């Protein structure tokens, strides 16, 4: 179906222990394809998917050049942010940046995004029109004034509507086997006594791709959302994902309880039962 390309950047200051740690990764949907780490020896943007390996030396040289330019930008940001917030030289702080584009089923531009965080909280974000900014506090207002005066939004919009979508389509084509696939979850439920009066029912979804999934428990058709323990969707390590949902029920009531699985790989949503 639909697709996304996203770059993620994390810079962490390390005061009196050298320069900040910078890590960049790029994803198409839930498949990583590149990385850069400022502490690594290579000092190169590196391949992390088989279908990006075919990119020639101009790609590798230019992507390394650009990622190093992003790293320098964040080095400056960390100093500026400490000034904006009247913070001391002492403590470690974190800047995060994410940008990228979505396309539909037909691979045409759906939407673009470009967002910053400082110390885990929204700082400034490009709005959906790609023409204006949401600044989360007074310090991010200062950035907004500067980014408006410099016409930063216009430069981002041209990238997100053009280059971003251009490279996404290219990746979807070259890595079609990996990227344009759907692996439906293999589903089952497990049952284990916790005492002589209660049992854990755990609904499992395995070996699925993409990561987006919904798992829910119903009792006599009623959602059991506050009684459900739902783990974060986790990577198997082979390019697929896993998730579970559990409820603890009275022994004897198992047949009231059903697990409900939705995933784009399923021809229909599944209902799993204890009878």
């Amino acid at each position: 179906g639909s697709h996304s390309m996203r770059y993620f950047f994390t810079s962490v200051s390390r005061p009196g222990r050298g320069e900040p740690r910078f890590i960049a990764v790029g994803y198409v949907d839930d498949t990583q394809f590149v990385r850069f780490d400022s502490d690594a020896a290579s000092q190169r943007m590196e391949p992390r998917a088989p279908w990006i390996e075919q990119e020639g030396p101009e790609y590798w040289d230019g992507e390394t050049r650009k990622v190093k330019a992003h790293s320098q930008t964040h080095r400056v940001d960390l100093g500026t942010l400490r000034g904006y917030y009247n913070q001391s030289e002492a403590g470690s702080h974190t800047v995060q940046r994410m940008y990228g584009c979505d396309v539909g089923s037909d691979w045409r531009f759906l939407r673009g995004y470009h967002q910053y965080a400082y110390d885990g909280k929204d700082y400034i974000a490009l709005k959906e029109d790609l023409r204006s900014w949401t600044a989360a506090d007074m310090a991010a207002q200062t950035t907004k004034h500067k980014w408006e005066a410099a016409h930063v939004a216009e430069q981002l919009r041209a990238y997100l509507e053009g280059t971003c979508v251009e490279w996404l389509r290219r990746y979807l084509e070259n890595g079609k086997e990996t990227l344009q696939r759907t692996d439906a979850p293999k589903t089952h439920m497990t049952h284990h006594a916790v005492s002589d009066h209660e049992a854990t029912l755990r609904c499992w979804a395995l070996s699925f791709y993409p990561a987006e999934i919904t798992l829910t428990w119903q009792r006599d058709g009623e959602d059991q959302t506050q009684d459900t323990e739902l783990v974060e969707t986790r990577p198997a390590g082979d390019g697929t994902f896993q998730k579970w949902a559990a409820v603890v029920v009275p022994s004897g009531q198992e047949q009231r309880y059903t697990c409900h699985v939705q995933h784009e790989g399923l021809p229909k949503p599944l209902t799993l039962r204890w009878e």
């Binding site: 770059y7 790029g26 590149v34 992003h70 400056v76 700082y123 930063v152 990238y159």
Partner: peptide, 7 residues
């Protein structure tokens, strides 16, 4: 493949 910025 990456984007031509400081806060």
């Amino acid at each position: 493949x990456l984007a031509x910025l400081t806060v």
